Write a protein that binds this ligand. Structure first.
Ligand code: HEM
Ligand SMILES: O=C(N[C@@H](Cn1ccnc1)c1c(F)cc(-c2ccc(F)cc2)cc1F)c1ccc(-c2nnc(-c3ccccc3)o2)cc1
Length: 449
């Protein structure tokens, strides 16, 4: 009962050549040809693609012993660190590591995060001056490396970003990893090794400093508005009693910071580009902002939580340009999928990119149209019609933080600046792990009157 196959052009390499040109177009073309589920061989991996919202239950509902996240990347050279994330000894242990991070994402902390957004943009606004042009993707990456770093690690990290080039070494954690790195065998990567070592030494020092801060001010552990992911990694332990090492704490922090940064900076870029390019969307965004802000001058938590239309704009950006283009699981046993059984050892693939352009879900899906959500509720037609943050067990735990961070940053930029996008909104570039717009993305800005 095998799903239909994409015919191998060559043995072993299989469909890799057309997949490598464009992974999203590959899944779109082969969906049209072969239906809601199909298999391709790609450099010796059996890849089974699930393409229609009506059949995604069997992917998202599975237990870790049926469809395995850990198995997809457990033989990967650890980008984050040994024994953390997909290198952890178990899925249960990975979920304890996820909890160390999610512990830092409370309402009490979200209230402080808004203050941190205002502070970082106020520094940035001074650099930008009264008017100019700025790369949108670079602006958003540079803002969120400061905001995400402070929100998750606390304000002691800032000195290392301003003075010790934590930013530079962080940008290389990623180095040479494209969405095709998964299929090529293990190469060397000394640049990445130098990055992780460098970030590791900075994170070791933050841990050492925070231990001394705990001894001087233990009442910190009672303050939900101060407790960050560093505090949680120093205070929490594994269920099974095995030691949480500083090696683990550093890898989990790098992995937390990577998650908290790339996806937010890219989504922020797409959302602002599309908002400022559409007269009616910009009108309603600024009307919402004007209503929420009243005669107040700065954001707080309750204001951001009201910004429903700016939230739809970001979810519309997430529909059209999801920064994670494939969600993958390893079949540890045969998986039923409609009339088919997907074989043991196949990797199942769900693509937010393909989900976002599904005409069964969304009308005129190449048009940025936030009202498709607020008015027509197109995201609600299917349970799995919108999956930019995934679903089930491994759903993003960062969703509310990402919404808070991107909505705040865009609200505050619109408060300071009139902004115009230079040229055509580009296509996504499928050349990085977290995919964002084709590089040249410039906008004009001018201080508002
Ligand atoms: C717009 C920004 C974001 C997008 C689009 C996004 C997307 C996703 C998606 C699709 C998944 C599911 C992956 C899978 O099923 O295999 C996921 C998982 C995850 N995300 Fe995010 N994410 C975002 C922001 C964040 C942030 C800001 C954090 C942390 C501060 C975060 C932490 C995580 C974690 C820990 C998981 C794994 C949960 C688990 O394995 O059980 N994400 N994210
Ligand atoms: O970072 C990855 N996934 C992201 C996706 N993300 C972002 C925001 N929300 C979810 C991710 C993440 F960065 C961190 C976490 C996480 C964070 C903290 C924890 F405690 C536990 C998990 C989860 C995640 F899912 C990731 C990293 C490496 C790879 C990978 N794919 N191929 C290679 C590879 C490397 C080399 C050669 C050959 C291949 O590496 C794939 C995905």
């Amino acid at each position: 009962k095998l799903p239909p196959r994409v015919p191998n052009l060559i043995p072993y390499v299989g469909s890799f050549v057309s997949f490598a040109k464009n992974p999203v177009q590959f899944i779109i073309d082969n969906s049209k040809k072969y239906g809601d589920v199909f298999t391709a061989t790609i450099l010796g991996k059996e890849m089974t693609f699930l393409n229609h919202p009506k059949i995604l239950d069997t992917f998202f509902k599975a237990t870790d012993n049926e469809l395995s996240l850990r198995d997809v990347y457990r033989f990967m050279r650890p980008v984050f660190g040994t024994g953390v994330v997909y290198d952890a000894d178990s899925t249960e242990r990975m979920m304890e590591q996820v909890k160390f991070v999610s512990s830092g994402l409370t309402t009490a902390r979200f209230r402080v995060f808004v203050d941190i957004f205002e502070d970082e943009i106020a520094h940035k606004v001074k650099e930008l001056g009264p008017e100019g042009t700025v790369d949108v993707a670079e602006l958003m990456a540079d803002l969120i490396i400061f905001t995400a770093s402070r929100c998750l690690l606390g304000d002691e990290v800032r000195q290392y970003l301003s003075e010790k080039n934590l930013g530079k070494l962080y940008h290389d954690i990623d180095d040479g990893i494209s969405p095709l790195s998964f299929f090529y065998p293990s190469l060397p990567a000394p640049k990445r090794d130098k990055a992780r070592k460098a970030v590791g030494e900075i994170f070791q020092e933050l841990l050492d400093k925070r231990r001394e801060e705990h001894k001087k001010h233990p009442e910190r552990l009672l303050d939900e508005s101060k407790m960050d992911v560093v505090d949680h990694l120093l205070t929490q332990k594994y269920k099974d009693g095995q030691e949480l090492t500083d090696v683990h704490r550093i890898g989990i922090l790098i992995a937390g910071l990577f998650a908290g940064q790339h996806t937010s900076s890219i989504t922020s870029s797409w959302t602002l580009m599309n908002v400022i390019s559409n007269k009616k969307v910009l009108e309603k965004v600024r009307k919402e902002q004007e209503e929420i802000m009243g005669s107040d001058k700065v954001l707080d938590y309750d204001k951001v939580m009201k910004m429903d239309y700016l939230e739809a704009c970001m979810k519309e950006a997430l529909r059209m340009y999801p920064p994670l283009i494939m969600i993958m699981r390893m079949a540890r046993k045969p998986r039923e999928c409609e009339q088919y059984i997907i074989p043991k050892g196949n990797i199942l693939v769900v693509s937010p990119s393909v989900a976002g352009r599904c005409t069964d879900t969304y009308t005129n899906p190449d048009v940025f149209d936030p009202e498709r959500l607020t008015e027509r509720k197109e995201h609600e037609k299917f349970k799995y019609g919108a999956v930019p943050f995934g679903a089930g067990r491994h759903k993003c735990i960062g969703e509310n933080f990402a919404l808070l961070q991107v909505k705040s940053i865009i609200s505050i930029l619109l408060r300071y600046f009139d902004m115009e996008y230079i040229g055509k909104i580009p296509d996504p570039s499928y050349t990085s792990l977290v995919v964002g717009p084709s590089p040249p993305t410039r906008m004009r800005y001018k201080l508002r009157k």
